[PDB]
Each structure stands twice: as C-alpha cells, then as structure tokens.
Amino acid sequence: SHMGTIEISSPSKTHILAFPFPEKGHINPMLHLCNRLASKGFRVTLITTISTYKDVKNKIKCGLINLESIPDGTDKNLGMNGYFNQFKNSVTESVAGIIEEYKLGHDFPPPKVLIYDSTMPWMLDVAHGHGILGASLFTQPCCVSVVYYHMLQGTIDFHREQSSSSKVLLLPCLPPLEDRDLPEFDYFKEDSGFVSNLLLNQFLNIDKIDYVLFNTFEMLESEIANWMSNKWKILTIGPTAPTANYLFETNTEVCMKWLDEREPNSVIYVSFGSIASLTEQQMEEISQALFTTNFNFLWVVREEERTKLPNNNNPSSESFTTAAGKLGLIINWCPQLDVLRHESVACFMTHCGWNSTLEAISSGVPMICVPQWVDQTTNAKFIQDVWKIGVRVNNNGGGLVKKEEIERCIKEVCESEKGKELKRNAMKWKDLSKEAVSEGGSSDTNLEYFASTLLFY
Ligand SMILES: O=c1ccn([C@@H]2O[C@H](COP(=O)(O)OP(=O)(O)O)[C@@H](O)[C@H]2O)c(=O)[nH]1
Numbered sequence: 144s145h146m147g148t149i150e151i152s153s154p155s156k157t158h159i160l161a162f163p164f165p166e167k168g169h170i171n172p173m174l175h176l177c178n179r180l181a182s183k184g185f186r187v188t189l190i191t192t193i194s195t196y197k198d199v200k201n202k203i204k205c206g207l208i209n210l211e212s213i214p215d216g217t218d219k220n221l222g223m224n225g226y227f228n229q230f231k232n233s234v235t236e237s238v239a240g241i242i243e244e245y246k247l248g249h250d251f252p253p254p255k256v257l258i259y260d261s262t263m264p265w266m267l268d269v270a271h272g273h274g275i276l277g278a279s280l281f282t283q284p285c286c287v288s289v290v291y292y293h294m295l296q297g298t299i300d301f302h303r304e305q306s307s308s309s310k311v312l313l314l315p316c317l318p319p320l321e322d323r324d325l326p327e328f329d330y331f332k333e334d335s336g337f338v339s340n341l342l343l344n345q346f347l348n349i350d351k352i353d354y355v356l357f358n359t360f361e362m363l364e365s366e367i368a369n370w371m372s373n374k375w376k377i378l379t380i381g382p383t384a385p386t387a388n389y390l391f392e393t394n395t396e397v398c399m400k401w402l403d404e405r406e407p408n409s410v411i412y413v414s415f416g417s418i419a420s421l422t423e424q425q426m427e428e429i430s431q432a433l434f435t436t437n438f439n440f441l442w443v444v445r446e447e448e449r450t451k452l453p454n455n456n457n458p459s460s461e462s463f464t465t466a467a468g469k470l471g472l473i474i475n476w477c478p479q480l481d482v483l484r485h486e487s488v489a490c491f492m493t494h495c496g497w498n499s500t501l502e503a504i505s506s507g508v509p510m511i512c513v514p515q516w517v518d519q520t521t522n523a524k525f526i527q528d529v530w531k532i533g534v535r536v537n538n539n540g541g542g543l544v545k546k547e548e549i550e551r552c553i554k555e556v557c558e559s560e561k562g563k564e565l566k567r568n569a570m571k572w573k574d575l576s577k578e579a580v581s582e583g584g585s586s587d588t589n590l591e592y593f594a595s596t597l598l599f600y
Contacts, residue, residue, distance in 0.1 A: 152598040154184035158245060158252040159597070162238055163280075164260040165192040165215070167417035168498050170199060172282050172358045173258070174208075174390055175383035181207035182388055183594050186251055190241055192216070192234070202390045209251070213237035223334045227341075235269055242273045255597055256353070261345045267352055278354035278593065281345065283497045285357055285364040285371055285379070286317060286525060287326055287518040288345070295343040301325070316370040323540075324524035330516040330541065338517065349375055354593050356380050358501065360579030360586045363530070363572065378589040379579075382505045384480055384498075386577050392478040397460070398441065401472050405439050405487040409469075411553065412482050412508070414443040415494040419515045423451045425543055429492075432549035433471060434463070438489060438557055440471045441482065449475075483508045490556045491533075492549075495519040500526060507573035509533050509565040511552045513544060532569040 159180055163173035170191065181187045188209040191199050196212040203210070216233025217226045238257070246253045256276035259266035270277035281288055293314055294301050303310065305322050312320045326342065328335040349355065358381035361368050371377045402410060413433065415421060421429070426444075430453055433440045449457035452473075463471035479499070482488060483506035491503045492511040500522050503510055510533030512523035526533040534552045536544045556562045579586040 152600065154594065154598070155186070156252050157597055158186045158188065158254050159256055159258060160188050160190060160238075160242065160245075160254045160275075161258040161280075162190040162234070162260065162263070162266065164262055165195040167198075168496050169260050169262075169282050170195060171390070171498055172381075172383050173260070173280060174199065174203065175385070176258070176280065176356075176358075176380070177208050178203075178385075178388050178390070179383060179590065180594065185594070185597075188241070188245065188251070188254075190238055194219075202392060204391050205388055207388050211241055213241070223331075223337050227337070231263070231265060234263075235265065238266065239269055239273060242269070242275065246273070258356070262341050264344055264348050267348050270353075271351075276353040276597070278356055279345070279349075279352045280356045280358070282358055283342075283518045284359050284500075284522065284525070285367045285377070287497075287521040288357070289314065289317065289367055289371060290320070290326060290521065291342045292346045292349075294339070295346050303329075316366040318524070318529060320521070320524065324521055326518050327514070327516040327520045342517065354378060356593065358383050358497070360576060360584075362575045362579060362585070363504065378593055380586050380590040380593070382501050382576055382580065382586075384502055384505060386505065386580060387484055390480075392481075393476050394460075394474055395478040395481060398472075398474065398477045398482055399485070402441065402482065402485045402487040405470065407486045408489040410439040410441055410485075410487045411436065411490055411492055411511075411557065412441050412479075412488045413492040414477070414479060414499065415513070415515065416496040416499060417445070419494050419496075420448055421451065421515075422543075423453070426451045427453050428544060428546040429549060432546040432553065434465045435467055435546075436465070436550065436553050436557075437467055437469065438553070439469045439487070440465075441477065441488075442471065442473045443477055443479075444473050444475070446475045480506070490553075490562075492553075495522040495526060497522060501576075504530070504532065504569070504572050505576040507566075507570040509556055509562065509569045511549070511556055512536065513549075530568065530572055532565055532572060534565070 161177050163170045177187045177189050190211045192215045193212045194215045216230040245251050254275050257270040258278040261279045261281040267277040328339045331338045355377040357379045359379050360381050361379050460474040480502050491508045493499045495512050495514040512526050512533050512535040514520045514523040523535045527535045534555050536548050578584045
C-alpha cells in the first residue's frame, strides 16, 4: 500500500501582485496583462494609487482582479523631482505593507511575484526584500529600450549639438538612427536629465530581475529582441491587449454610435494620448487640416486641453460639419482600441506613444506620426521606415507641424496608392500580432513560461 501527501501548485493557488506607474500608458498594458493572467486562473491583485483607483475600478469588469489602493505619494503640482522622490518613498512603504498583509492573510495565497513597472526598478528590492519574485514590465518597445541601455552604458556620445552638423547613430541590431529618431528628452528643458535618468535606470538592476517582460511581439522586433535575448532572458509577451475579464473605457457608446453611422474607411481617428499637451498654435494647425480634409474625423482632446483649442464651460464633446462636407467629433476620451478596430477608421493620427502604436498594429490601422517626446520619436521612425505602416510629419527640422504638412500626410496615407500599401502592411502586421498571442505563438509561449515557472518548487 501507499501512504502520503500530494501538494498541488496551481494558478488558482498562486497570487500575482501587479503595480503600474500611475499613468494610463503604464496602467493599461498592466491591466491587460492582469486580465490574461487571471484568465489562466491566477489570483491577481492590482495595486494602484488612489487617484487612479477610480479610473481603474470603472474599467475592470467581470470580478477576476482584486483591486488595492495606495496613497498617491505626490500631489501632481510639484516639479518632476520631489514629485518623484516622495513618490518612491511612499509607494515602497505602502506596497511593502500590501505584500506583508497578503503573506499573513488566508483569503488569498501569499504573494509569489510582484509585477512592477520597469521605470520603478527599486521595486525589485521591495519584492526581494520581502522574499518574493520581481517581474519588470517594460511598457516601451525593445528598440527604444535598447537605446536607453546604450545611453546608460555611456559608451557612445549621445550629446547632440544638432546646429553644426547632423549625426547618425549605429547601434547593433538597430537601423541607423538620425538625430530626430533618438528618444526626445530636450522638450523637458531643465528636467531633461531627470526624465532621461528615469528611462535609463530601467536597466540598473536588469541582471537581477526575475522576469523581464516586454509588451511587444518577437516578429515585430525580431533582430533587437534576439539581441536582448542573448544578454538577458527577456520575455516578449505582447500585445497584452486582447485581439478582436476586459477593459471598458468611457464614451464607448457615444463613439461606437457615431462611427457606426459613418462609411467604412472614412474616418481619421486623432489622439495624442493621455499626457501630451500641444501648443495652441499646434492645435490650430491640426484643426485647420482636419476641417479641410476629405475625411470624417474623431479627435480626442482631453478636458484640460480644450482651452488650447482655437474655438466659459468647455464642452465635453462637440460635433462638426467640416469645410469639405464631412463630419467631425471632438470628445474628451474614447475606447481607443474599439475605435481603432472600427470598420469606419481609415487611419490613426497619433503621438506614437507605444500603446497607441501597438494597438494600431494589432488593429491594422495605418498611422500619421506626430511624435512629441521620449520614445515617440523612435516609435515614429520604426512606424514609417521599418514596419512601413505610417508616415512621419516634418516639423524647422519642437518645431511646429503646419497644416499643409499634416494635410500632405493625410492625403498620402488616406488617398494615395502609397496609403493603400501602408494599409496592406498594417494588415500584415496585425495578423502577425494575432499569431504571437495565439496558442503556440511567441508571446503566448513566453507568457506561459512566466506563468508555468511561477508554479515551480
Ligand atoms: O481617447 C483615448 C486615448 C487614449 N487611450 C488609451 O490611453 C493609452 C495611451 O498610452 P500611450 O502609450 O499611447 O501614450 P501616453 O498616453 O503614455 O503618452 C493607450 O492605452 C490608449 O488606448 C484611450 O483609452 N482613450
């Protein structure tokens, strides 16, 4: 006869903590990843600052994710330094308290891993200091991330005096990068060094991270992902957003109704993300282009940005018939993924934030690139010249993008034979995007590696 005990380690008895930096471009890929992990059966606790808790609570539906709030640690009114140092002190202690709370509880399994935003690398020390694994979630592509790595290593001169000559930078497994293709820190002026260090320091403890996760897929970034694979065991697990236990954004019904009433491939979707704020002159140039183009438009203009519009109680939305006989809608926020996947959307005029770029890739929507800072410039270079799914506008070579140049790009993407090829390329990358996260695809495999190895004794 036999006698003894069997212990089973399963996703249902495995507790994943996740902690995004409180900006939408960081929260959203983290949330999507939490949804996929919950679907595999894991217990998942999303930790987020109290000021983003409401936004996140309104978005998550059907249940599977356990939500915890922590203090903001900031007030958003101070300058970047201080807003950040207080921030790091505050969330270290509060996440540490959550970790210990769940180690001692009985409703949940003890935490086995903390998934933390890659720009908060000190959270690896919190995870290890409490005896649990640390997964660093990068929310930018491999290609721009490697540029930060090379910048941190201080081997090549990244200083730019662009006024006396033009520089082109060659890094391994990357295309030649002109000066305008480098991640853009000069916009931030005296805080350029601080923003820079934030992104560079993602790599301070790369050798010690238990899981390095990238919201990208291998085929999209083949050469550079492999390069990174040979140095670190990175796991490309993207897109974390679902293909065509979910996220519900506001104004979903409004935008879907409006788009349903347009013709297929008739709408330019315009958004500059959750953070960027364009000058009122830049808003003017974009306005006049969209009001004279041969297409309908849906333009997200955030509430705080309505004052920058050309034009006492800023409307939450505004409906238009344009000078070319088309229809426009300005709205404070939309379900961007549903919008990009709508048959009416012909192209995406974007600031080229990474989530916007990859959502567009996963939706097969070609792009007009109007990058503003950090990784957006590098993303635009890859969108136009590598993936060939969009066109980048030309600034005085920070410079204003004039309506005529915006119109140029709209006509190329939306009217020309070249535009038809960009669309074909975008549908191709969308299929590869789907294959990566389907069973046996590179991202499904890499995410299963993370999930399966979490169970090991
Ligand atoms: O009307 C909008 C505009 C943006 N987004 C989402 O907000 C995120 C923007 O992140 P991104 O990386 O593109 O740029 P960031 O906002 O960080 O500059 C993306 O997940 C978008 O889908 C949205 O849900 N509704």
